[PDB]
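Supplementary Note 2. Why include the ligand at all?

Several targets in our set were suspected to adopt different conformations when bound, so apo predictions alone were not considered sufficient. For every target with a known small-molecule partner we therefore ran a joint prediction. The input for chlorophyll A is given below.
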Amino acid sequence: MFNPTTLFQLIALFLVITSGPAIIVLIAFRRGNL
Amino acid sequence: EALGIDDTRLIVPVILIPVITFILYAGFASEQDNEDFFDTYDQRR
Amino acid sequence: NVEYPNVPYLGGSDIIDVNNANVRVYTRLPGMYPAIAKKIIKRAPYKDINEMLEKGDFTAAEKDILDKYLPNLTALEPAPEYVIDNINNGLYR
Amino acid sequence: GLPWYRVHTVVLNDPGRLIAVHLMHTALVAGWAGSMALYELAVFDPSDPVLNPMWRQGMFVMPFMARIGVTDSWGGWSVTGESVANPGFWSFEGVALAHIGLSGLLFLAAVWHWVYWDLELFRDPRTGNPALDLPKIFGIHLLLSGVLCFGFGAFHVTGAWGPGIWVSDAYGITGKVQPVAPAWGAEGFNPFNPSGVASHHIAAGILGFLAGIFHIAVRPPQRLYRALRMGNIETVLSSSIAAVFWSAFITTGTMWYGSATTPIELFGPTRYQWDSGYFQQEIERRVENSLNEGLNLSEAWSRIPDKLAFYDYIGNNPAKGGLFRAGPMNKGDGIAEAWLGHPIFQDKEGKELTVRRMPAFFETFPVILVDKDGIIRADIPFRRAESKYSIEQVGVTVSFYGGKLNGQVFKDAPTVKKYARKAQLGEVLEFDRTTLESDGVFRSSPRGWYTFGHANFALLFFLGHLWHGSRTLFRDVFSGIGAEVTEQVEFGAFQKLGDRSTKK
Amino acid sequence: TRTVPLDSSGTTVILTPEQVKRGKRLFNSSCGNCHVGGITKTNPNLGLEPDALSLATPARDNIDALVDYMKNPTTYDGLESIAELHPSVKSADIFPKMRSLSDEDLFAIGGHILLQPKLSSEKWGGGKIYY
Amino acid sequence: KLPEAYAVFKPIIDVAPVIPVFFLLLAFVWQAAVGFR
Amino acid sequence: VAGRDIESTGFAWWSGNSRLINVSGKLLGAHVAHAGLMVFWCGAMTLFEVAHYIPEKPLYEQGLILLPHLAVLGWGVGPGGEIIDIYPYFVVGVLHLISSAVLGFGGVYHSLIGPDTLEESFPAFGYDWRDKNKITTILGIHLIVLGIGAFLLVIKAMYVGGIYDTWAPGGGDVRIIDSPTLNPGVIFGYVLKSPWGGDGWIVSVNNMEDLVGGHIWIGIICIVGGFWHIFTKPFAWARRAYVWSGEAYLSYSLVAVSLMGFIASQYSWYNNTAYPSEFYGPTGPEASQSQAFTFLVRDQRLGANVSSAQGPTGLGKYLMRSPSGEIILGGETQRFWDLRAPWIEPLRGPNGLDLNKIKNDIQPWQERRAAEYMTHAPLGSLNSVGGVATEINSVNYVSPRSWLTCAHFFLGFAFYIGHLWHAGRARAAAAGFEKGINRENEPTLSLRPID
Amino acid sequence: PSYRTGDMAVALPGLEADGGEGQDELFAETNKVFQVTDGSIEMAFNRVDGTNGEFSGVFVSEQLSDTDMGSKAPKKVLLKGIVFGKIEEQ
Ligand code: CLA
Ligand code: CLA
Ligand SMILES: CC1=CCCC(C)(C)[C@H]1/C=C/C(C)=C/C=C/C(C)=C/C=C/C=C(C)/C=C/C=C(C)/C=C/C1=C(C)CCCC1(C)C
Ligand SMILES: CC1=CCCC(C)(C)[C@H]1/C=C/C(C)=C/C=C/C(C)=C/C=C/C=C(C)/C=C/C=C(C)/C=C/C1=C(C)CCCC1(C)C
Ligand SMILES: CC1=CCCC(C)(C)[C@H]1/C=C/C(C)=C/C=C/C(C)=C/C=C/C=C(C)/C=C/C=C(C)/C=C/C1=C(C)CCCC1(C)C
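The joint prediction is reproduced in token form.
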């Protein structure tokens, strides 16, 4: 259920999976040359 | 065994035939212009 | 061959025939494999049981095992189709 | 010019030459019937109707001649095995020669109708163009078919004026042509009740006669005339092909599964009689009843007829043949000579063993012997494997009761293996192999060949029906589409699809 | 079932489901490549079927005999040791995969070996025929 | 097994290999964000 | 924005990387970012295999393919192929991860904010695809870089600790290669050897001396050719022969790397010198011969005359005769009689397997190696189930050799497909009909009818 | 020994229905008999080494061919080659 190794797995996976789309969304918010 | 050659008589045609074909090709190439071009391919023949 | 009457003793019944059976049939009898049976197969042809007990180089403990397994053990005429396959016989399961 | 696949469309609007080509086709079919009957009579052996019946010899139209009355021959024999002193004209040869003469007459009629194509009957009095009033033609033909069906079922089947149809018992031992009284209850829909044939034909003939009167009397509605394109003869072709492959599926089913119209003394047994152990159960029941009367095994098994034991055999199974194993069934396992009797297999302890019978799926089946409980007590190894339950080890002995080997007991291993391999196939028989040089692979019965041919023909005629319905309903765009399609294919251009008046 | 014999006298032990699962996992990891399905891929004359284990000197149809075989493997006659050829805790330097197995691990492996004949009978040690 | 000074960072190391697949998907997402111009 | 749409480039979004053909700076950025991706995978997978490494099981039983690559080169390997320390593997992974960070920053910079075309800002780096001299200069620079890499391998093998020689006496050990084979006859007789059975072309390198010597040769050849291409321009025959465009060069590279993929797949499948079986596991031939050899030993020791045991067809059941007349292992493994393994070569005489050396000169480590290799045969499934396809779901093993061979055969075929596509399109774009047939002047309509 | 080592006409189920005599024409081919034929070998020693136990010479052999497990007539084979052997302690 709650395993610290699994918790850190999910946290790292969430950060990795949301880093790139965060870059795209932030560039779109600053109206960059996307 | 280089190129599957075990008898030295086999080397005579393997070397000789490309020489004759190269002689014909060299006549063809000496007929050409043979100066550098600036294009993707040479349209001169 | 199509017809061969002496083949319930190749491992199909309790009584085991020597010089016609594989080494796998001695695994049913405890203490008869992989020792003892090697001596049986190496000097294969026997006239009867006493020939196996005499011509084989059996130690006293091996002779005690042989005394333990008298009745489920026989010696019939040799068949060369089964002599050549008394070590492998192609059975693996 | 016309392509090769449209060469017959020249008689599509020519009624006289349409009748001519129909007459030519009818003449060809009648001539095939006559010639096939003559060939089958040339190759038929009527000596032994019990072990060499007509279905073992590959007779195809002989069963259909024997189904509804024609059983005698000018040679002095009958297919029931009896001797006929005065055969009469309507024998097999008489039917064949009548078909040949009918073929010749229809050929001459076809010639006349091809030459004399411009009859005034075929031209419409209102317009003058060559036309056929197809609804009234259908009424006339339906009335004729109703009259023929009613007459057949009321005089031929019932024996009022006619021979009757072939009626056999439940196990195909005593079958002959008998008059058949109709059954008007629900038991007439029992497919194995032959009274249903007579009752069906009488009732359907009456209904078809009434419907033909109606269709002669009443013109079609305009909605049905425009919808079904009743002015076009290709709708008649499409619906006729549909009904024909419907009937072909029906006959395929009634041939494969069996009915009163496909008796086993003419077409052979079915595969489901072998699957269910039908004849085996009957034979066991008779043997048990004879044993309950104080008889021993020899007298009980000797009372079983050879026909009944011959039916309990996998070589007579229609589902054991091959697609390219051509010829009669006697070209396979051979010509049956005698029933060798029922084998009973006993081990060294006297326990009885039964060889497990081969299913119809298996080209080859392993020979295994089970006890009364169902446990493998003996078998034959595959080809050369080391064995544990072999015939030589268990000491299986076989004793035959009834038949040719009645009372004999075989104890030697090769003979016991041979008879166990025979008993795997059912009842043990004796076959002759040097007469036809039989190869030794089972061949199908006329039942199986009929089923194969007519199932494939029905499947292909489904495609034919689709093609001709398409060519009927799409006659205006036969050569292609025009420029009036581009406006209809725009999505949402019209409210109703294909209707120009519903434009948005 | 979960009940396998423990001693040679006839004592039985009831295995916990965790022991059964761990024995199955350890048997599939450390023994599967040579004992898939209860047979021996490298010496097919012997197998893990209960008849072969019971008809041996000593009989390997109990927990303690299997643990002793995993600690000191002998031949089918029993006079000759095969510790060089067969994996063992004596030869853990020879076979590196044995160095992680403890006494409870051998207990679970023996319980799995004894427990499989009662699960899908005639398939354990029957080879490819009973698949 | 990782050295014990860095054994706590195992989940990040487990996630790390599949990141180029996320780069390919990121290229597709970036093309989706500009309307596949 | 111009240059990044179909209206200004003529290429759609799914063919948008072809907008970078004439945009040199962004093309450099794409290449550097891709290099960062490759180094990132190297580091991440190395650290992944370090984190998943079990010290008890060997490398090939854990599905590891990069740790064996580092074990070939002699980091953290003891005698006999034992993995004694995985810290250098961790060092390699971390170094690659940081270097990939640097390369990714460079790729992003040059893709997004660097100059699009280098031909005006930095003329020493700018180029045109039709300019043969500059392209040959770049090719020579990269050739010299590759030669430096080959000499890095040479320096590692000869001076810095050495590499793992699986043919070393005793069972294989990390060995300094002090006398590499510099004879051009051997090195280039490897290249001219037939690729068929029993010869194997360059897959059959069976000692580290030939490997190191020919890597010296490759480094020398690459450096000499790199300076040759830096200081020369293509000759007239080469100018007539080839198409001078970026896509044509790409197609040439695609076919070269496709051939390399095929060759590496065969290396992984057959070679056990550069791919030692202590790390990658036994080959198919090695596993079959291990099974046959272990049965031979178990029957020679346990009372069975193997040389006189007639098989089911009259041939040898354990030992038979090769088609060339040598003593080989019998059975279905007779097709794999070309196998050379360090655990069997001491037991191999001039006529094949020497029976006296079989019964007398067996070292126990050879017994251990043959007993280990006979079970983990390269036979597996896509769901990672060991054994043949008719096995139950209880064995979890697929050989790393199978993975490497299948993956690189797949990629070699795919890159041959890419070569064909790009060579065709390069020819059609150079000639000028890659966008379709011209309606005004159709070449076919101006030809005579053929029949 | 026989060329091959160790009960039906599987192809023809209708052949084993003839009654009393089934598949007996195809019996000798079905009955695969292990037949151990005999042969004679005569070898002469042309040269003999004195330092070792080695001898060399020629041999003449006469034996029988494959019997197809008792399905074809064994043709006799004549073999004339060379021979070598070592004699040492037992
Ligand atoms: C190896 C993969 C790879 C690489 C390196 C590139 C690289 C490039 N592509 Mg490209 N592309 C790819 C795959 C790739 N592509 C695939 C798979 C497709 C099909 C969907 C496309 C479709 C495509 C089109 C249609 C176009 C390009 C274009 C370009 C160029 C301009 C990029 C741009 O303006 O984006 C701007 C993007 C952003 C501002 C958002 C992404 C921001 C960064 C790059 C994300 C990653 C940051 C990273 C995680 C952090 C690293 C920092 C470091 C310090 C650690 C650039 C050289 C364009 C071109 O040709 O220009 C002339 C163009 O029009 N690509
Ligand atoms: C070093 C390798 C390399 C490089 C630099 C390029 C570079 C290029 N290729 Mg190319 N190609 C390669 C290898 C390479 N290719 C290989 C190996 C193949 C064979 C599969 C192809 C097949 C190919 C085609 C068919 C096309 C290109 C095109 C292009 C251009 C635009 C690419 C683009 O925008 O991608 C955008 C990237 C994507 C949209 C991502 C797609 C992801 C795919 C669908 C994943 C599935 C792959 C699949 C499993 C493989 C099939 C099996 C295989 C055996 C065939 C660009 C010049 C296009 C062009 O216009 O050329 C000028 C074009 O039409 N290439
Ligand atoms: C091989 C093949 C192809 C694929 C299907 C299938 C597998 C079933 C198989 C079927 C093939 C087919 C369709 C075969 C057709 C055979 C046919 C139609 C045979 C018919 C022959 C007709 C005959 C003798 C007619 C004889 C008539 C005669 C003398 C008449 C003569 C006379 C006339 C002309 C005038 C009056 C006087 C008199 C004497 C009556
Ligand atoms: C030091 C330490 C001890 C043990 C623990 C631990 C392992 C964590 C270790 C920590 C290591 C660390 C923090 C490493 C840092 C790694 C980093 C920053 C890696 C990232 C590199 C970045 C890369 C490749 C990016 C390249 C960019 C690309 C492709 C962009 C391509 C594209 C562009 C240009 C246009 C659009 C389309 C697309 C495909 C998106
Ligand atoms: C010895 C050995 C053991 C293991 C490691 C080690 C590296 C040492 C290894 C190898 C060492 C060495 C020296 C390897 C050398 C490999 C070599 C020389 C590879 C070269 C291959 C050459 C190739 C494809 C040529 C391709 C060009 C072709 C077709 C033709 C191109 C064109 C022309 C010229 C004719 C018309 C057609 C076309 C297209 C216009």
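The radius of gyration of chain D is 30 Å. Chain D is about 40% helix and 10% strand. Comparable summaries for the other entries are listed in the accompanying table.
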